């Protein structure tokens, strides 16, 4: 159930020069590439080991495509300002996201959509041949892209190029991309008292934490934080509960994760 995803952002700064462009790429939960237009020598930079040995031809072609897209965004930002009758003084944001999902081993579904100032603008439909415009301004873009046969080009990338290279990355980095890392767990006691179940250093980010009581889920009184990055490629999460001081040994924490042979059960 692997996937490859790209995220691009352009932000305009009237007066302080031409817009800022940043793009990043992921395979599942692992970043592997970045590009920033404000760097001294702007170029595509690897962020995972399994793309570090692709050769200078590969990385020069990627760099040229990034610089082309930043120039394309600069024109689009000027066009959007005209569609919406906006002044030339304010700052505006344009975001773009695309990628492919794999299953039998081929394309499960593709993505390609855009946003302006935080709201939907235009998106490629799941048929990879028609568009969904969000307002009357985006209808101008749809008419231009239909006349340019542009949906044909995005479908060809998503069904061929996206799938081929995702398979290549998954093979060259299969020792880290296809080997899950199990969480390290422990329970802490904080004085009626508080029981906290920890899970640290796991990959991928998908995980489930559940407190119990003689086999009964305790969902009603469970504090739970959002999954957060550890900073080294792994993730953390904890779930807490409050308990009558004395019944601590009646409660159990349960962990479900890809890196465990079978689900875990913990006590304080």
């Amino acid at each position: 159930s692997h996937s490859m995803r790209y995220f691009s952002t352009s932000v305009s700064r009237p007066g302080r020069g031409e817009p800022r462009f940043i793009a990043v790429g992921y395979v599942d939960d692992t970043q592997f590439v970045r590009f920033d237009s404000d760097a001294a020598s702007p170029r595509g930079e690897p962020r995972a080991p399994w793309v570090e040995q692709e050769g200078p031809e590969y990385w020069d072609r990627e760099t040229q495509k990034y610089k082309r897209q930043a120039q394309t965004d600069r024109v689009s930002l000027r066009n959007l300002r005209g569609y919406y009758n906006q002044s030339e003084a304010g700052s505006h944001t344009l975001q773009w996201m695309f990628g492919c999902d794999l299953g039998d081993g081929r394309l499960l579904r593709g993505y390609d959509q855009s946003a302006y100032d935080g709201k939907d603008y235009i998106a490629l439909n799941e048929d990879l041949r028609s568009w969904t415009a969000a307002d009357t301004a985006a209808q101008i873009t749809q008419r231009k892209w239909e006349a340019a046969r542009e949906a044909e080009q995005r479908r060809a990338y998503l069904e061929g190029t996206c799938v081929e290279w995702l398979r290549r990355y998954l093979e060259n980095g299969k020792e880290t991309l296809q080997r899950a890392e199990h969480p390290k767990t422990h329970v802490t006691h904080h004085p009626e008292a508080t029981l906290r179940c920890w899970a640290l250093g796991f990959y991928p980010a998908e995980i489930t934490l559940t407190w119990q009581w003689d086999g009964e889920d305790q969902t009603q009184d469970t504090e739970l934080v959002e999954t957060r990055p550890a900073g080294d490629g792994t993730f953390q999460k904890w779930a807490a509960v409050v308990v009558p001081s004395g019944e601590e040994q009646r409660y159990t924490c349960h962990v479900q994760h890809e890196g465990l042979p079978e689900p875990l059960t913990l006590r304080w």
């Binding site: 790209y6 990627e62 495509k65 990034y66 082309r68 689009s76 892209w145 190029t161 290279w165």
Partner: peptide
């Protein structure tokens, strides 16, 4: 592998 497309 990145991809670059038309202007809006």
């Amino acid at each position: 592998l990145y991809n670059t497309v038309a202007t809006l």
